[PDB]
Amino acid sequence: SDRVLQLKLGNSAIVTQEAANYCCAYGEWPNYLPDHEAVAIDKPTQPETATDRFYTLKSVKWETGSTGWWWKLPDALNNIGMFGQNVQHHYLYRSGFLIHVQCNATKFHQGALLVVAIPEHQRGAHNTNTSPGFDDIMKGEEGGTFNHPYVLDDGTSLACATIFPHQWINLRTNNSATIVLPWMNAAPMDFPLRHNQWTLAIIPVVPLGTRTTSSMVPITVSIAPMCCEFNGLRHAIT
Amino acid sequence: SDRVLQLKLGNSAIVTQEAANYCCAYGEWPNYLPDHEAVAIDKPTQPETATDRFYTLKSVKWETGSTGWWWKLPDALNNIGMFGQNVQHHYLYRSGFLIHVQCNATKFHQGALLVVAIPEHQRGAHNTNTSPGFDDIMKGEEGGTFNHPYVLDDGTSLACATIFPHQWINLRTNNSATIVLPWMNAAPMDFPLRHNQWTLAIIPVVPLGTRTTSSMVPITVSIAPMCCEFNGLRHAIT
Amino acid sequence: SDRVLQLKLGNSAIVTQEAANYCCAYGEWPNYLPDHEAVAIDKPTQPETATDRFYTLKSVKWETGSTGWWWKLPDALNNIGMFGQNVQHHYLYRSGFLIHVQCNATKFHQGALLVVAIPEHQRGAHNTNTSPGFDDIMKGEEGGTFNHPYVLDDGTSLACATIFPHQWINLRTNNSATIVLPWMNAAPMDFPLRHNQWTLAIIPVVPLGTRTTSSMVPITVSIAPMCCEFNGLRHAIT
Amino acid sequence: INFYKDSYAASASKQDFSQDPSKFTEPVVEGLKAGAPVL
Amino acid sequence: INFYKDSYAASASKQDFSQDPSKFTEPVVEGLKAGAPVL
Amino acid sequence: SMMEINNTESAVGMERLKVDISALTDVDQLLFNIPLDIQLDGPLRNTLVGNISRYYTHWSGSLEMTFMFCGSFMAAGKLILCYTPPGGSCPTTRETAML
Amino acid sequence: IESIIKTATDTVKSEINAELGVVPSLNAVETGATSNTEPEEAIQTRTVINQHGVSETLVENFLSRAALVSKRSFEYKDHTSSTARADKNFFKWTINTRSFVQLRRKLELFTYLRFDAEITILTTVAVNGSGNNTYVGLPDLTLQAMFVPTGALTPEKQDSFHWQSGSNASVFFKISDPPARITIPFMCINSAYSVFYDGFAGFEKNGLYGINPADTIGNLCVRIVNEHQPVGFTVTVRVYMKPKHIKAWAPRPPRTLPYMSIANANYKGKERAPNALSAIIGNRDSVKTMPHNIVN
Amino acid sequence: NLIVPSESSDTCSLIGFIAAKDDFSLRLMRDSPDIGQLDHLHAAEAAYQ
Numbered sequence A, B, C: 001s002d003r004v005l006q007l008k009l010g011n012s013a014i015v016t017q018e019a020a021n022y023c024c025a026y027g028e029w030p031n032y033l034p035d036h037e038a039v040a041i042d043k044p045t046q047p048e049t050a051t052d053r054f055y056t057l058k059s060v061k062w063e064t065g066s067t068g069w070w071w072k073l074p075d076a077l078n079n080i081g082m083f084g085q086n087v088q089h090h091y092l093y094r095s096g097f098l099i100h101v102q103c104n105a106t107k108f109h110q111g112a113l114l115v116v117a118i119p120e121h122q123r124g125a126h127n128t129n130t131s132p133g134f135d136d137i138m139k140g141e142e143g144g145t146f147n148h149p150y151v152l153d154d155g156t157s158l159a160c161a162t163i164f165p166h167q168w169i170n171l172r173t174n175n176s177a178t179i180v181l182p183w184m185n186a187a188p189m190d191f192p193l194r195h196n197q198w199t200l201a202i203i204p205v206v207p208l209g210t211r212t213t214s215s216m217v218p219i220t221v222s223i224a225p226m227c228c229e230f231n232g233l234r235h236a237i238t
Numbered sequence D, E: 001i002n003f004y005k006d007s008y009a010a011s012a013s014k015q016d017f018s019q020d021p022s023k024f025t026e027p028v029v030e031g032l033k034a035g036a037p038v039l
Numbered sequence F: 001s002m003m004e005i006n007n008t009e010s011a012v013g014m015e016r017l018k019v020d021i022s023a024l025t026d027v028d029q030l031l032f033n034i035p036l037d038i039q040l041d042g043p044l045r046n047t048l049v050g051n052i053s054r055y056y057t058h059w060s061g062s063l064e065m066t067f068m069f070c071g072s073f074m075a076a077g078k079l080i081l082c083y084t085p086p087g088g089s090c091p092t093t094r095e096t097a098m099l
Numbered sequence G: 001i002e003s004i005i006k007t008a009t010d011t012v013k014s015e016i017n018a019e020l021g022v023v024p025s026l027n028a029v030e031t032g033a034t035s036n037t038e039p040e041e042a043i044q045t046r047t048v049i050n051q052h053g054v055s056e057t058l059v060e061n062f063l064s065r066a067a068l069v070s071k072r073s074f075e076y077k078d079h080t081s082s083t084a085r086a087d088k089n090f091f092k093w094t095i096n097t098r099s100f101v102q103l104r105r106k107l108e109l110f111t112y113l114r115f116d117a118e119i120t121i122l123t124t125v126a127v128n129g130s131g132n133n134t135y136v137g138l139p140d141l142t143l144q145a146m147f148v149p150t151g152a153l154t155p156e157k158q159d160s161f162h163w164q165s166g167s168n169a170s171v172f173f174k175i176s177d178p179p180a181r182i183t184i185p186f187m188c189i190n191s192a193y194s195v196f197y198d199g200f201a202g203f204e205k206n207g208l209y210g211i212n213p214a215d216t217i218g219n220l221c222v223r224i225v226n227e228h229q230p231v232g233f234t235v236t237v238r239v240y241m242k243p244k245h246i247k248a249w250a251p252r253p254p255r256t257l258p259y260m261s262i263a264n265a266n267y268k269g270k271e272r273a274p275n276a277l278s279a280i281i282g283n284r285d286s287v288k289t290m291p292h293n294i295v296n
Numbered sequence H: 001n002l003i004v005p006s007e008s009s010d011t012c013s014l015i016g017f018i019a020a021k022d023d024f025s026l027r028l029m030r031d032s033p034d035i036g037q038l039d040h041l042h043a044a045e046a047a048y049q
């Protein structure tokens, strides 16, 4: 009853038979911007199924020495499908996200992945006074990897990352994690090309292990924007 | 009361002070596809202000020997703004159009332009048995020119073109023409890259003339899609 | 309905067929001094039609290099008709004004005049620490010309002069401007020979231009005092 | 807190929210209507 | 004691005892019941 | 209040308060652009809105630009005025600005 | 029409418009009226409930701020061998609001102003180092500020019998105290001060131009009450004025060129733009040049 | 295009105006950078004479 789940958005659907539950960040659900909170006065465009659908990013391989992976939103989706086109043609965007992380192995495999959505994951640089550059932060669809997951690449602690909305993929228990993210920002809308509201981090707290014949064990991320709206139409910028 | 007009769609607006009236093709107004006429069962996307707005094409010069100009829809708009992106990312589209043609001169100038929207303007070739090719028909935003406007480039008559929705731009009378086009098709929706429902033709029945110092006299076309909807989302094709 | 106007005061009348509207300074109309605001206790004289009538000043020529013109009130009218006599024979005066500025040309002419009534237009001198002298300020019926209209001859901006009651004479649009001025003073009455409540400024923001055969293009000012009253009768001083 | 006997000694008055911008934005005898041509 | 005209000048507000720890301890769509297995 | 659109070395005095337009022999040509920054020294600085606003640090709300054509009665023409929300470069072609 | 406005106006959502005879985006600037085009008529809008306050732009708030109006330094010492132009332990100041540009420009945004004036006097002292470049400490002196109205006699020396102030309002304050403060009422003989006065102050032709005699205030006379010490000090007095209970009329174009004098509006402008006589706004290469164009 | 007859001026001028709508608001008063002084204005000293 809580291990099987189907998510359907637009023309996309996902089914998992080894879920635990799914997390609604801070007990909230995505919604459109209400009139009593709006700032931009132009009529927003709400593409609905054109943008509110699952986009699957490139899979990554879970290796023995893997330190972890991250993707910044909306940066990771800014060049994908109609969501990317709307982002490129509009000065302002707003949306939640539905995140589904997939990783399966055998009953002889072991490992634990922490799947956490970090709001405003401002990254720090290691052993230097220079702030991270644009190329260090904006990785797009490919995402990045943690240099020091122990401190979340920001001088904090991985052990306390559970304060953020998160699930675990414990191979003996489940093969997928689902997190629903509301709009998380100090402003009602934002410029999607210069600010990232959420960071999805997947960190192998317990390394992948087995004594059976080894196989590639990928981790796959599917993200569906929810309640997308865009304001300030102009020419494409990207 | 009938010479001044303002058209506002999305983030675009047009004002003319020398209009005659405006024509609603066959006395109809654009609308969305009703449930009792729909065929495609997927939820359509309706971008609204993102696509239902005025797009201005490249102006053309009205010369003494000008034979006339034409633009095919939706071909002319298939690579412009969010309308173009939605067309490229969807197998099916449906929309009306709001056409505004602009041409101004002095009170010492004379000339008459017929502005007619031809439904299913299937073109013929002159003095050959070979049918027109793809490059002859699909001209995109630049449009084309009439080889033999006298017969509408199709073996018919220009004199009888008034059976189609049309206005005139008579320089001594008005400097703009406005035509509202409903969806005109045998099918509820269509593939926008292979079929053109409407052809806009501007033909100088009375040539431009004056004895005052000559100036460039452009003709400018602005077209706003109305009640756009798209079905069959996939990757961009263009 | 708003382009034709007739003004009738006393034995004078003015008709224009190319007006835009007329401006009532700060949305006010002239009136006599009420009892609850009076200071001087002697019975005032109210000549009515003898003074509340249109006086036409000397016309000025609009040239290519014209910088603009100004007239100070009541100084400009202080020696004209019965208004001048009453001013000369009384220590105190009070009145509004009705200003009508006239300038006509052909449909081949272009130009724009800003017609603004400046309250307390205290003039400054250019490139000197010495304040303007009596002869620089008190020009009478002939008025003066702007040395630096760009800064209104007072170190301020011409661009912001629209904060004052004003109209425009745009040659393609209208050939006259009308402004109704109420009494504008810190005191209920004033000595007319030493203080000017209003300054009428006509500044050619867009120079006169044409390619047709040139003609003299005058600008004519007609000013009618309204609700005149005078106190403190004595011998003529002028 | 004003214990002074003269009223002009009081603190500032920041509660006058009355406005009439038409005195400067529309000082015309004939009011203009929305949409209708001015001229 | 606040005689200032601007409300943000007031002293601190230490009387908001409202809590909702479930926002961080139980942010799951399906609430869990006591004793019953979670999975 | 009037903008100083023509803030160029060639313009003196009130010449800076008007923009001249002439007949062109090419279509869809750009005529002028207006920087929208009130804090920087631009065409909007010496206006009522600009002068008053520069006594403050934060601002919000819509602005309106009004243009008066001061040609002869016999002159005719059509122009397109575009506002581009920020994010990219100022458009240099009509087909981009009209979006 | 007059109305009570506390927040910026809300926006109402709007639909497509195609109506013959209706052109809300067209206007007639020639009438002198500002364009009445609404955002809902120019573009398609959404509904927005605007909660933005407008209180900080109230005229009272805009002008009711303490601003420097007078700053005078004088030597506190034995003035037996001082020149006639030297301030000998006291000074007098003909009150005006035109000496410091920040307050002057804000005041000159209006033609007429009516307000009461809160006056704050701030005093600082420093030991004289000329020759006697030795520090012994700062004395806590007593000062007297006397308001001398029009027609009253001003003191001519630090120990003048005019300081007895039989009817003049005087305030005695110490340097160690918080700055002295008093409220001066609206004292104009008219209903409002004339910020600008296009007239002459006298019945002859040699009177001063641009200063309304109705607004004449008087003189502020400040002395050190203490007799001089064996060593000399430099005393600096700063006077701040804050208008309150303000009424304002007829706003004016702001001052652009630098001020030249406190007696007139004479202008010269900077040598080059910005704020030059021939170019107020800084130059750009052409009307098609975007000064701060964003590239990538 | 701009089209004029031979007798009209071939160059025409536009005047651009700007204003805020009644949804405009401002906050955080500050000293305007549009005015400043580096010395006392002329005749300011005379007030103390």
Ligand SMILES: Cc1cc(-c2noc(C(F)(F)F)n2)ccc1OCCCc1cc(C(=O)N(C)C)no1
Residues within 6 Å of the ligand: G069, G095, G097, G107, G113, G117, G119, G145, G146, G147, G148, G169, G170, G171, G182, G184, G193, G194, G195, G196, G215, G217, G220, G239, G241
């Ligand atoms: C600065 C000052 C100081 C004192 C004073 N100092 O000490 C004392 C004493 F003796 F009681 F202790 N009185 C008195 C009055 C003062 O100024 C009055 C400001 C009024 C005004 C008019 C205008 C104007 O002309 N406008 C706006 C066009 N502006 O402001």
